[PDB]
RNA sequence: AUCGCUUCUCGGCCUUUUGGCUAAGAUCAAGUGUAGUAUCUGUUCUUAUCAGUUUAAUAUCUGAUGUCCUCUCGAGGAC
């Protein structure tokens, strides 16, 4: 079966992973790790 | 119906087989036919077709033809620019609300 | 506002925090009068190390059977018989170990190598 | 509510078909005493702990027999209260 | 097949047709079955690996399924777990050349993979333990019982009473000591899901061997007003 | 209690660290406060063990200790800084050598007898960087001319190479 | 209330830990148990086993085991002497190569007997190569995470190990005793590490080990440590019944 | 049989009549649910034996055939020890399916 | 290291007894039970020697031991009650010199349990049942028959089983084919269960109870019972019929008591004492075993007490009430 | 040397992205019932004590939101 590394949630078929990624829980902890990036830049 | 999970493999499908073979896309979902895959891909997931809301132009326009081509929304709809669905049930809409 | 600060920087949500039970204070008198926030951290508090030093300050060791204590008086007192007890279930010679004299009665053998080369024993 | 009686109703059936079970509302006093009077009735049948207490104190397999059975119907005392 | 008597008979011609040719081949044409999706058939192939293996000996069939354990599927892994349950519960007393070999597989799987995987590896250990009753394998049933024991907090029916007939399993081939070490401490927890649970499996204990237990209480002492100490089992003679 | 691994092995993990200190005395914690990104250690790390003794020989033992073939530092927690030495003892050793000259600097090279290939036994010279040039001056100033292990000591700011 | 009642019952903490007789036993939901006696007293019992850690947890028990990937299990080595695995995984891909046609091809035309495996391998795998595996004594539960713990508790500086003494660049394998770690050097300057007056070196507080020489050069263990009048430093650098099974078999 | 919770036994003291098997239910065992091993035989109420209930499946309750057995596991558990064995009531199953079909064809 | 188990002095402490024509001719044998050892012994009318025939290990222990004789038959089977969960009926075969299974017949589960019966065994003197019966909460009772073939055949068993009643002795009362009754000593804990005091600890009082089979209608009810003054430890049936009374000794601590159902009143004896003894005087005294000899002529109960001296009772009777009783010492 | 050009050569790894025709060459994908669990998607909880319910504890749920006048839960004051 799927995982997503980042929202750590588990999934039957990869349909269910693609559903996943398009919604609210996926996105949202997609917009708080870029901003985390953003944070992280630096004789 | 069809469920987020069906219509995303749906476009998964099509943006790889491309938009006439639907024997083979209808061949990797279960439950469901190439007649009925192919209404659905040019009903709604086709990223061609606008979800958003109705410019007044938009509605003057769907009046008038309305009026003047009573019936016939699959030869309004283009037209104007969306499906005859949306069309249709969105002028129904307007009616009742200046009903 | 005052919530907790996530791993996003950002403040996690009220009922989450309800959840956690972070809304409770408990007292670590040792630890200073402190207060923690969460059952969770309070128990870590224990060998957390802000009470490794009160009880340090105190001289009484921490231990695992002072976890959960937190009153200084309760501590010294559970101390006192623990000191008791380990007291009693150690082994000195020094008070126990009985020696008899030449002359057949009895010593304990501190006694009987202090007049043992006290010039006599 | 809905669970908490329906398994006390099974624990009921156990115990009143059962004499000795427990449920989460069985006190020190009950447990202990079950426990009692099943080491009597227990030391009635092997006919060989019955020798061992008799000989360890110094009457006769009948006596003994006679006195555990006294015995067994309070063994722990009286009642919790 | 509807039918369960063309199913039970189907699984018994495999066995008869491994009898006649080897068992590798028909063996490996089963592990495949063990590849589709609906569980009947999958349960039937189940039951025809088990019957091929105590046919022809349970020596050749068993490093071909601990190797399909490896196969990173579902329903393969669980295949592989139902059909040991089988097949132990069929070879009966001869557990006891294999219950090496299968252990590390077992809490392997008890470590979860999913529910269902602690819910079959808990069957596997009824039926072992009810096999090797009597021959002292019992430190691996011990050991096992390290990794059931902690699955006794679940709430779903199939796990929950599946870790149950492991238990009284268990309970028979390691004792009513054990067992009894092991329900002490929760008997009387502050809580009440763990004093629930507690006593229904003391209760199990008791009701069988509960003779057996005389013997094996704890020394608990008396207070103020009663007087809990047997005295009888201290005369000195 | 409180020991500052230095030169912590890119690889040599919590598990190499604690296990040594472990095996010299109560390891109580090994922690490699390490880089949040890349992961490995950060070249710094903060080990406690209980007693201040235990972490003194701990120190003691644990210079030029080779994690990963390179000598871990274990201590309290390049601009040409090192001495050079002539009329050095040939019965000298490298540890006892930064043990005795290290007072006055810790040993940012471990102190390296110019000896031949030949035989293997010292021909009087060696060289060593210390932390500071101020630390070479303080080292060599209290080594200059004074009496070695075998022969007195001659020891100045490095010739390099 | 009488719930409130109970509740003036219920011991502070420390009024439990002072009366039982074992005060470490006591935890904190101990107060709140109907027989907080009798339960501490159960829980001092020898050889009881204690209730699992994941009652109070709010998530369930490996549905937190959850995030991480997990390599595949790993055969015995009395299994793994036999060679079914890469048979099997010949097959494997050689069927992942296979298309539908063939499938069913096959299906209909068997390949008999295209490969085999021999008996006797078998049964000297199970009946004369088995061994016991490692197990657990009575009363080590597992737990979430009981399988990454490295160890602990060992204190003694003579366990040494492989990748220790490889990122060392000290040997391992039978020259292990022979070998002597970083530490001996300075052991036998500066004593063992002071906690450790109770250990002792091989090869600076303890004889050589077997076949393992004192000496300076690469590979040696050095000038053992003696005082002035030659006495070792610590225990001795130079190295100054019928337990026979009673009834067993042939 | 260990597979619908639903069900309940007499559980009433024992006797000596020996007990029968429907022929869809032969074979298997009646608490374990299981094939194989079958050690000793069943012996049913003398009210759940009385008219018209002799002779029938302990189980199904139709027309009993042969005898039936306990697995060596219910033996050596001593589950066999517990008086009659019979289901004294029909379930869901039954009538449920009977419905779907009366209502089918 | 694998141990193998042999016996070399077989047990040799005996724990029942009993006595009858196990051989089917009209010599008296001994059927003893050592622990878990069954052994037949005969002692020889002649000599005056006992011969042991035979002996088997039953592997199992024997809780209790009946010989009971069909009615109108000539041998005598074992009833055996034992820590198993069966009651089972022996006969032995002379001409072979073993013991063979009759019946066996399974009503619960192993071991020297509580509410299972097998402690108390009891039958009724014209052999057409037998009562198993554990110390509290169980009895079924048997029914025996000969078939055509006139051998033994064993019924479904019947019940009588009564929560919170402690027993302390069961015996087969005699009456002349009337539905067969049986005389249970008792108690009822179920109070003192309840009384947070200690008052219904103390004034819980032993009732006697006889149980009576219906054998037209196939079910055991519980005819009569009655308090008894003080507790007593066991029963003694007097042989009923036509021959003597009918009814039950009590052999309570320092008394021994007739008593029967009906009218007939209740009697009683204290136990002599031994002249200028020096036992603690506290102490009281009961009887630990006794023995009916009974023929055509007369019957008398011998009975032994704890110091080891037996004593000859005898009843004095109107033609049915007993009216008084009659000790005499006999030895020790 | 540099600028312009010409030709050749070496390189990156890039770039490039596929068997012609025809009537898209033609055709086409058959389960269910009973009990139970899990996973995603979706939706949602700043409020304040204090009492009670309950709980292992939270929670939950239930309940009103020091005294007096007044200005507007807020404010001054004698207390
Ligand atoms: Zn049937
Ligand atoms: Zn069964
Ligand atoms: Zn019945």
Redesign the interface.
């Known amino acids: 079966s799927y995982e997503c590394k980042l929202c750590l949630t588990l999934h039957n078929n990869e349909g269910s992973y693609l559903a996943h990624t398009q919604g609210k829980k996926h996105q949202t902890n997609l917009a708080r790790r870029a901003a985390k990036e953003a944070k ?1 830049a630096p004789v | 119906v069809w469920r987020n999970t069906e219509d995303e493999i749906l476009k998964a499908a099509v943006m790889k087989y491309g938009k006439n073979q639907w024997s083979r896309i209808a061949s990797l979902l279960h439950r469901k036919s190439a007649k009925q895959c192919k209404a659905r891909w040019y009903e709604w997931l086709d990223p061609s077709i606008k979800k958003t809301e109705w410019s007044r132009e938009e509605e003057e326009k769907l009046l008038h033809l309305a009026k003047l081509m009573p019936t016939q929304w699959r030869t309004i709809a283009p037209i104007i620019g969306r499906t005859a669905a949306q069309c249709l049930e969105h002028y129904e809409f307007l009616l009742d609300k200046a009903a | 506002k005052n919530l907790p600060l996530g791993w996003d920087g950002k403040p996690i949500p009220y009922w989450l925090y309800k959840l956690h039970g972070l809304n409770i204070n408990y007292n670590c008198e040792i630890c200073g009068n402190y207060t923690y926030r969460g059952p969770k951290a309070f128990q870590r508090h224990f060998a957390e190390w802000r009470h490794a030093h009160g009880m340090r300050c105190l001289g009484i060791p921490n231990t695992a059977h002072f976890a959960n204590v937190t009153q200084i008086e309760d501590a010294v007192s559970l101390w006192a018989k623990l000191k008791l007890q380990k007291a009693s279930e150690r082994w000195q010679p020094d008070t126990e170990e009985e020696y008899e004299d030449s002359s057949g009665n009895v010593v304990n053998k501190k006694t009987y190598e202090d007049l043992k080369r006290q010039g006599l024993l | 509510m809905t669970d908490r009686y329906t398994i006390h109703s099974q624990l009921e059936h156990l115990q009143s078909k059962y004499i000795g079970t427990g449920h989460a509302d069985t006190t020190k006093w009950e447990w202990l005493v079950n426990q009692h009077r099943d080491s009597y009735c227990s030391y009635m049948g092997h006919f060989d702990l019955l020798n061992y207490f008799a000989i360890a104190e110094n009457e006769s397999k009948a006596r003994v027999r006679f006195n555990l059975m006294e015995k067994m119907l309070q063994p722990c005392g009286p009642p919790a209260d | 097949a509807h039918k369960k008597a063309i199913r039970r008979a189907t699984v018994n011609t495999f066995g008869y047709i491994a009898k006649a040719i080897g068992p590798h081949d028909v063996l490996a044409t089963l592990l495949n079955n063990l590849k589709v999706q609906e569980r009947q058939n999958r349960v039937c192939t189940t039951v025809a690996i088990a019957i091929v293996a105590e046919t022809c000996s349970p020596f050749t069939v068993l490093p071909a399924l601990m190797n399909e354990y490896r196969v990173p599927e579902l329903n393969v892994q669980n295949g592989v777990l139902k059909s040991l349950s089988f097949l132990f519960e069929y070879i009966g007393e001869m557990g006891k050349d294999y219950i090496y070999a299968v252990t590390p597989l077992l809490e392997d799987a008890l470590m979860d993979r999913d529910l269902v995987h602690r819910q079959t590896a808990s069957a596997v250990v009824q039926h072992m333990s009810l096999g090797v009753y009597g021959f002292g394998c019992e430190d691996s049933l011990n050991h096992l019982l390290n990794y059931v024991w902690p699955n006794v907090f679940e709430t779903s029916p199939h796990v929950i009473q599946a870790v149950m007939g492991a238990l009284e399993g268990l309970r028979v081939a390691i004792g009513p000591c054990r067992m009894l070490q092991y329900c002490l401490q929760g008997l009387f927890h502050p809580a009440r899901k763990v004093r629930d649970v507690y006593w229904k499996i003391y209760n199990s204990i008791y009701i069988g061997s509960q003779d057996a237990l005389i013997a094996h209480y704890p020394r608990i002492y008396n207070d103020d007003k009663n007087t809990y100490i047997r005295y009888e089992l201290d005369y000195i003679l | 209690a409180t020991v500052y691994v230095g030169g912590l ?1 890119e ?2 993990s919590e ?2 660290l604690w ?2 200190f ?5 390891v109580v914690n090994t922690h490699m406060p390490k880089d949040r ?1 890349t992961g490995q250690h950060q070249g710094y790390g903060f080990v406690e ?3 201040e ?2 972490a ?3 120190i ?10 390179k000598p871990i530092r274990v201590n309290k927690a390049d601009v040409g800084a090192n001495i050079f030495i002539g009329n050095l003892d040939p019965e000298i ?1 490298e ?2 050598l930064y ?1 005795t000259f290290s007072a006055f600097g810790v040993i940012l090279q471990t102190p390296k007898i110019m000896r031949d290939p030949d035989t ?1 036994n010292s021909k009087g010279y060696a060289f060593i960087n210390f932390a500071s040039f101020d630390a070479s001056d303080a080292a060599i100033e209290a080594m200059n001319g004074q009496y070695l292990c075998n022969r007195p000591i001659t020891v100045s700011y490095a010739f390099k190479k | 209330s009488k719930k409130k009642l109970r509740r003036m019952n219920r011991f502070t903490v420390a009024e439990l830990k002072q009366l039982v007789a074992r005060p470490d036993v006591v935890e904190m939901h101990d107060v709140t148990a109907q027989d907080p006696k009798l339960l501490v007293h159960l829980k001092a019992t020898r050889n009881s086993v204690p209730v699992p850690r994941h009652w109070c947890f709010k998530r369930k028990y490996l549905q937190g085991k959850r995030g991480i990937e997990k390599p595949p299990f790993e055969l015995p080595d009395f299994i793994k002497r036999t060679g079914i695995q890469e048979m099997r995984e010949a097959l494997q891909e050689k069927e992942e190569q296979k298309t539908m046609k063939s499938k069913m091809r096959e299906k209909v035309r068997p390949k008999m007997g295209k490969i085999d495996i021999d008996y006797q391998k078998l049964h000297d795998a199970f009946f004369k190569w088995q061994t016991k595996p490692k197990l657990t004594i009575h009363g080590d539960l597992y737990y979430e995470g009981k399988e990454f713990e ?1 160890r602990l508790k ?4 003579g ?1 040494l ?1 492989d ?2 003494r490889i ?3 000290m040997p391992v394998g039978p020259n292990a005793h022979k070998v002597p770690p ?2 001996l ?3 036998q ?8 007056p109770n ?1 002792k070196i091989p090869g600076l507080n303890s004889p050589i080990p077997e076949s393992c020489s004192f000496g ?2 690469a590979g040696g263990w050095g000038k053992p440590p003696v005082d002035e009048t030659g006495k070792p430093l610590y225990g001795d650098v130079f190295g100054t019944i019928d337990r026979t099974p009673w009834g067993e078999l042939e | 049989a260990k597979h619908h919770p639903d069900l309940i036994f007499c559980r009433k003291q024992a006797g000596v009549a020996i007990g029968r098997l429907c022929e869809k239910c032969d074979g298997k065992c009646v608490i374990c649910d299981s094939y194989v091993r079958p050690c000793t035989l069943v012996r049913i109420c003398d009210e759940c034996n009385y008219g018209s209930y002799q002779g029938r499946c302990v189980i199904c309750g139709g027309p009993g055939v042969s005898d039936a057995y306990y697995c060596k596991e219910c033996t050596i558990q001593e589950k066999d020890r517990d008086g009659c064995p019979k289901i004294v009531n029909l379930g869901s199953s039954k009538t449920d399916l009977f419905y779907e079909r009366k209502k089918y064809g | 290291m694998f141990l193998y188990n042999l016996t070399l002095q077989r047990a040799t402490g005996i724990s029942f007894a009993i006595h009858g024509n196990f051989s089917g001719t009209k010599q008296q044998e001994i059927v003893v039970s050592r622990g878990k050892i069954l052994e037949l012994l005969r002692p020889d009318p002649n000599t005056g020697k006992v011969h042991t025939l035979l002996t088997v290990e039953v592997f199992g222990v024997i809780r209790s031991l009946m010989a009971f004789r069909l009615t109108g038959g000539t041998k005598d089977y074992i009833v055996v009650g034992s820590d198993s969960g069966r009651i089972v009926i022996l006969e032995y075969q002379p001409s072979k010199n073993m013991f063979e299974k009759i019946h066996q017949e399974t009503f619960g589960k192993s071991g020297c349990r509580r509410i299972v019966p097998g402690q108390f065994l009891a039958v009724d003197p014209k052999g057409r049942a037998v009562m198993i019966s554990a110390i509290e909460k169980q009895k079924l009772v048997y029914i025996l028959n000969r078939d055509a073939a006139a051998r033994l055949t064993i019924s479904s068993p019947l019940e009588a089983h009564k929560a919170n009643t402690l027993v302390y002795h069961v015996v087969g009362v005699d009456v002349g084919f009337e539905n067969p009754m049986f005389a249970c000593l008792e108690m009822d804990y179920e109070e003192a269960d309840n009384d947070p005091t200690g008052e219904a600890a103390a004034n819980t009082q032993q009732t006697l109870t006889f149980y009576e089979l219906d054998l037209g209608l196939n079910h055991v009810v519980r005819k009569y019972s009655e308090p008894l003054e003080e507790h007593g430890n066991f029963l003694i049936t007097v042989p009923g019929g036509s021959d003597g009374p009918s009814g039950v000794l009590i052999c309570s601590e320092n008394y021994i008591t007739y008593k029967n159902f009906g009218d007939q009143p209740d009697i009683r004896c204290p136990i002599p004492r031994r002249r200028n003894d020096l036992d603690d005087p506290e102490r009281g005294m009961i009887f630990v075993c006794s023995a009916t000899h009974k023929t055509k002529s007369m019957f008398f109960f011998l009975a032994q007490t704890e110091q080891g001296d037996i004593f000859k009772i005898t009843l004095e009777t109107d033609e049915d009430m007993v009216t008084e009783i009659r000790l005499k010492y006999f030895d020790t």
Request: proline content about 11%.
């Open positions: 992280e | 092995d690889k040599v598990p190499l296990e040594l472990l095996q010299a005395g109560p990104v063990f209980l007693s003794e235990d003194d020989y701990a003691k033992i644990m210079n030029m200790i080779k994690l990963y073939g050793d540890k006892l043990d293997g | 490295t060992e204190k003694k500086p366990d190990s990748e220790l990122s060392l660049g970083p530490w050097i300075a052991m300057r500066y004593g063992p590490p002071p906690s450790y250990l300076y050069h």
